[PDB]
């Protein structure tokens, strides 16, 4: 949760990440030659949770 300035006052914003976009980017980068990084940090039991 972060604060953002809206017109002399502030608004509190809570960020929810996108799962559908993450799947879409990873499929379309698998057959491309632009720079990419693979993150290897989650386990099988953590992903299930």
């Amino acid at each position: 949760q972060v604060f953002f300035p809206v017109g002399g006052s502030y608004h509190l914003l809570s960020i929810l990440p996108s799962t559908v976009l993450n799947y879409e980017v990873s499929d379309r980068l698998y057959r491309s030659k632009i720079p990419k990084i693979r993150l290897r940090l989650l386990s099988s039991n953590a992903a299930s949770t």
């Binding site: 953002f4 300035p5 608004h11 509190l12 929810l16 379309r28 990084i37 993150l39 989650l42 386990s43």
Partner: protein
Amino acid sequence: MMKGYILLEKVNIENANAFNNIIVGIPAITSFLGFARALERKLNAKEIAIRINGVGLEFHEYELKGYKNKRGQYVTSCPLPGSIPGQNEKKLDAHIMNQAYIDLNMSFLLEVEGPHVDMSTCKSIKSTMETLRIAGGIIRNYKKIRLIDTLADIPYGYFLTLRQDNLNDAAGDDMLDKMIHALQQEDTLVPIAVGFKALSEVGHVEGQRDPEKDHCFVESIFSLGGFECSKILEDINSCLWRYKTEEGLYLCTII
């Protein structure tokens, strides 16, 4: 005076966040303007009236925590997790989530407008830039805090600008195809995060950081950007980021 320009020169930051759910690299622009707004709020409680309404981001060197393999790819590192609140909190080994960290040397250009913009203001900024952070990272040292007049006092480096025309004007059915094709054509552009969009309506929920303000659930939005040297820059207004707020949209744009 009234208007003016202040340079924060060669700032070293260690361990800043570098993960924004699709991008591992430069931190999001909202943190870099959040540093400026936090500096404004701490300066206005010491009774030095000032208002920062534009930030410029110049990059001099970088390093990502990890290593580079033989094939040329990047493998990232993380610190060992400690104790995290929750159910499995009295255990000795904790869980590993998704994270990335970067080190940067940068210089900031601030447009200030107040009742007096002198070197005493620079001393007041110097006594306040040792308590803040930048993007969740500590500040180790700085060179000087000084006032600039023209585009010949700015040191050598590379600024970050917005290139939204090279995205909206490319070939593809959807925007992600537009981004991939625009990155295959020009190889000096990077993808960046530029703010948030709305997924709900403004109201009061239960469990907030500050329980007396207005809330909205959000999702991050992404765009394109590129680098331009100091000596090839035309004006000092074509490198300054600003806050803009429509209905449902929270953005940072150079315009």
